[PDB]
Amino acid sequence: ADLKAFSKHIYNAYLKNFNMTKKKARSILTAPFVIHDIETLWQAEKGLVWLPPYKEISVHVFYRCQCTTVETVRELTEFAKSIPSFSSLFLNDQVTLLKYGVHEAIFAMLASIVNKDGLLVANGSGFVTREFLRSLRKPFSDIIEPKFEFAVKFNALELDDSDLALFIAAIILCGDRPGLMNVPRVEAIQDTILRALEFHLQANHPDAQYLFPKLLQKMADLRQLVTEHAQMMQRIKKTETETSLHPLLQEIYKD
Numbered sequence: 080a081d082l083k084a085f086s087k088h089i090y091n092a093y094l095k096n097f098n099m100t101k102k103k104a105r106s107i108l109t110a111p112f113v114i115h116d117i118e119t120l121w122q123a124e125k126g127l128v129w130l131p132p133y134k135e136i137s138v139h140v141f142y143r144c145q146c147t148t149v150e151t152v153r154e155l156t157e158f159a160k161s162i163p164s165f166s167s168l169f170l171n172d173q174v175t176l177l178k179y180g181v182h183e184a185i186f187a188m189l190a191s192i193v194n195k196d197g198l199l200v201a202n203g204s205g206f207v208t209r210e211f212l213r214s215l216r217k218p219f220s221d222i223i224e225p226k227f228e229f230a231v232k233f234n235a236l237e238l239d240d241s242d243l244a245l246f247i248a249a250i251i252l253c254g255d256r257p258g259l260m261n262v263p264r265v266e267a268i269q270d271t272i273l274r275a276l277e278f279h280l281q282a283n284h285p286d287a288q289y290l291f292p293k294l295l296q297k298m299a300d301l302r303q304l305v306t307e308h309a310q311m312m313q314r315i316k317k318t319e320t321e322t323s324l325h326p327l328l329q330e331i332y333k334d
């Protein structure tokens with residue numbers, strides 16, 4: 080009943096806080112400058128499309144990834160704060176939820192800007208090919224591929240921005256997070272969001288392909304995806320000594 084209005088407030092918060100909507104993304108994807116080799120990557124840097132001291136091609140890509148990720152974390156923070164029930168939480172719990180939730184949300188939203196062939200970069204000014212990213216030296220290519228596999232299956236669910244606003248909110252407001260102080264309040268908020276989501280999916284996808292429980296599965300898939308990604312990020316930290324890691328991302332991964 081009150082859930083329809085509750086979803087509108089979340090959707091509003093999403094529209095207010097993210098630079099790239101799926102609506103914007105899909106329209107661009109169907110012109111952005113194409114990065115498919117070293118030459119085009121260099122031409123993208125020469126101002127036409129767009130940091131620590133230069134090392135190499137794969138590390139340059141890794142550095143630009145961090146920049147993007149840091150910026151997405153900022154947006155997710157503002158999104159979450161635009162939800163009143165999130166803002167009533169003590170700041171430590173807010174930080175705990177963002178700590179353990181941002182990468183799950185990042186990979187979910189990433190599907191919005193991805194097709195079988197590649198992904199948009201630089202606020203839609205660029206399109207980097209999947210084949211080009213495959214060509215980067217290990218471990219970077221290994222880290223990248225699973226996100227394509229995830230994003231393609233996820234895009235088959237044909238969610239829109241209003242669906243995603245609730246889905247991301249549910250990811251952030253998660254009672255399972257380690258070190259959470261007020262577990263009961265968060266669980267109660269999660270439950271309201273999930274109820275709003277099921278209600279919203281009924282109204283928005285009337286002939287739903289068992290859509291709500293498939294999204295719950297995707298949430299579990301995202302948790303596994305982040306687990307594996309964190310393991311791969313630990314490998315970078317251990318093996319790539321000369322490569323710098325953004326302080327905030329270091330804080331997120333810590334413990």
Ligand SMILES: CCCCN(c1cccc(-c2ccc(SC)cc2)c1C)S(=O)(=O)c1ccc(OCC(=O)O)c2ccccc12
Pocket residue numbers: 114120140141143144145147148189193198200207212219222223224226227230312328
């Ligand atoms: C669907 C493929 C996603 C691949 N990764 C990603 C995500 C967003 C932007 C970019 C990117 C690509 C090209 C350029 S210029 C040629 C710039 C950016 C990439 C590679 S990823 O989502 O798998 C990914 C996410 C985050 C990473 O480190 C940051 C963090 O964990 O906070 C990644 C690090 C290495 C490889 C992929 C990363």
Ligand SMILES: CCCCCCO[C@@H]1O[C@H](CO)[C@@H](O)[C@H](O)[C@H]1O
Pocket residue numbers: 152156174177178327330331333
């Ligand atoms: C908004 C995203 C912030 C995620 C970084 C959280 O970083 C966390 O901050 C806590 C409070 O300073 C620290 O106690 C904790 O050690 C650190 O991992």
Ligand SMILES: CCCCCCO[C@@H]1O[C@H](CO)[C@@H](O)[C@H](O)[C@H]1O
Pocket residue numbers: 145309310312313316324325328329332333334
């Ligand atoms: C931008 C790259 C920052 C990632 C550095 C990874 O850092 C590591 O992540 C592990 C997670 O497996 C944590 O257990 C460990 O404490 C942390 O130092």
